[PDB]
């Protein structure tokens, strides 16, 4: 089989920035060479056919180039829509085969989540378990520190989190982390609190209910 | 206004066979070659194989020559993969494809299907529970004000989410689903709003598990203290 490499599997640039994604195959493809945009919600669509002819509806800030066994995907003036992993395809000889994937990234300023938190419902609660969840809404970069604190105590184990991909308008992430509980240990304890840190923040933000005033 | 558009998700056994349909329109069938392509959750694209559907010619990558038949019926213009000996490594999205010709020999795949999420596992479809995600208090200081729906506890994926029958849109994020340690889903999704503009809708989020025919229409109620 033809490997196909996509050397660096993610990238991050300004607006307006020029962008190039690489794709190298293992021995010499003679122009044979397709790219793909996969949309963060998955829809596929072609970008460029052999080598550097544009498909339909593609703006002309999309160019490719390349020979023998290196190419080149260009953007020329990146915009937030351009969010997507672009994947190369050969068809020198079957199997085709694609390279790895290229996810890009805008780069953006800094900004701080708005956190907010949020009891479990009883709907939830008289069937036995409880999640709490928090929510960092809308922050650049994509690293957080998301701490739960059960009556100030830190807990560990008990809690899974998921981001978005970033938003093709504004290119922010957002993050869920939810505290599963017992509705018996959650009826325990008076304060929850969800700890975040974030480079956007003066310093750690602290959002907290006590069950009983809720 | 070239569509392929695939069968919805499938939850079969391992051991068993899946058969799924990618139904064309806007183009001639019979004038186009057919190619299918796999990806596994959070990985690369692999071929699996074409098919010429005037006469039934087909094409396999020689990794799937034990796990795919491409078949077509032209008289409903559809393409089908039928997928046999399922394992947990079958589980992925799949894509039907359009093959263009272009010259003398430059081919690409010029119109991509919206992909089949098949899931192989021995486990039970289970519809979602859907809870309020409604704070406990509002700021007066906070410019925007959020809620959501959690929608626990189902099997397999995919669930969709909409807020107030997709006429809400702005400001909504539905987080990746999670697998919880019992091996059913959860996630949540949450919209946020200006909170000056927070009063003026109400706030349905709208929950669709296909595997289990489970639709949940759940109004979040807006009532919240001030601090």
């Known amino acids: 089989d033809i490997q196909m490499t996509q050397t660096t599997s993610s990238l991050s640039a300004s607006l307006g920035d020029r962008v190039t994604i690489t794709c190298s195959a293992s021995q010499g493809i003679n122009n044979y060479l397709n790219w793909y945009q996969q949309k963060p919600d998955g829809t596929v669509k072609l970008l460029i056919y052999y080598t550097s002819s544009l498909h339909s509806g593609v703006p002309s800030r999309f160019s490719g180039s390349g020979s023998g066994t290196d190419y080149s995907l260009t953007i020329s003036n990146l915009e937030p829509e351009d969010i997507a992993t672009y994947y190369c395809q050969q068809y020198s000889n079957l199997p085709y085969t694609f390279g790895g994937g290229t996810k890009l990234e805008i780069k953006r300023t800094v900004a701080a989540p708005s956190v907010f938190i949020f009891p479990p419902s009883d709907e939830q609660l008289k069937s036995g378990t409880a999640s709490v969840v928090c929510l960092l809404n809308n922050f650049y970069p994509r690293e957080a520190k998301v701490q739960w604190k059960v009556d100030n105590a830190l807990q560990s184990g008990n809690s899974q989190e998921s981001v978005t991909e970033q938003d093709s308008k504004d290119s922010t992430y957002s993050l869920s982390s939810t505290l599963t509980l017992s509705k018996a240990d959650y009826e325990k304890h008076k304060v929850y609190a969800c700890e975040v840190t974030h480079q956007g923040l003066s310093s750690p933000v602290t959002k907290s209910f006590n069950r009983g005033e809720c | 206004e070239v569509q392929l558009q695939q069968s919805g998700p499938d939850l079969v056994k391992p051991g068993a066979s899946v058969k799924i349909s990618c139904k064309t329109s806007?183009?001639?069938?019979?004038?186009?070659?057919m190619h299918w392509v796999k990806q596994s959750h959070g990985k690369s694209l692999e071929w699996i194989g074409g098919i010429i559907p005037n006469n039934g010619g087909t094409s396999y990558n020689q990794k799937f020559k034990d796990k795919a038949t491409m078949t077509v019926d032209k008289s409903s213009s559809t393409g089908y993969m039928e997928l046999r000996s399922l394992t947990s490594e079958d589980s992925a999205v799949y894509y039907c494809?359009?093959?263009?010709?272009?010259?003398?020999?430059?081919?690409?795949?010029?119109?991509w299907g919206q992909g089949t999420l098949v899931t192989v596992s021995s486990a039970s479809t289970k519809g979602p529970s859907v809870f309020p995600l409604a704070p406990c208090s509002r700021s007066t200081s906070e410019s925007t004000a959020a809620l959501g729906c959690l929608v626990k506890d189902y099997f397999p994926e995919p669930v969709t989410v909409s807020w107030n029958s997709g006429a809400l849109t702005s400001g909504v994020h539905t987080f990746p689903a999670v697998l919880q340690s019992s091996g059913l889903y959860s996630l949540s999704s949450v919209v946020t709003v200006p909170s000056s503009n927070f009063g003026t809708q109400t706030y349905t989020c709208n929950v669709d598990h296909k595997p289990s025919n489970t639709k949940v229409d759940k109004t979040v109620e807006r009532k919240s203290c001030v601090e």
């Open positions: 806007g183009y001639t069938f019979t004038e186009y070659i």
């Open positions: 494809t359009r093959r263009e010709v272009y010259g003398r020999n430059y081919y690409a795949l010029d119109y």
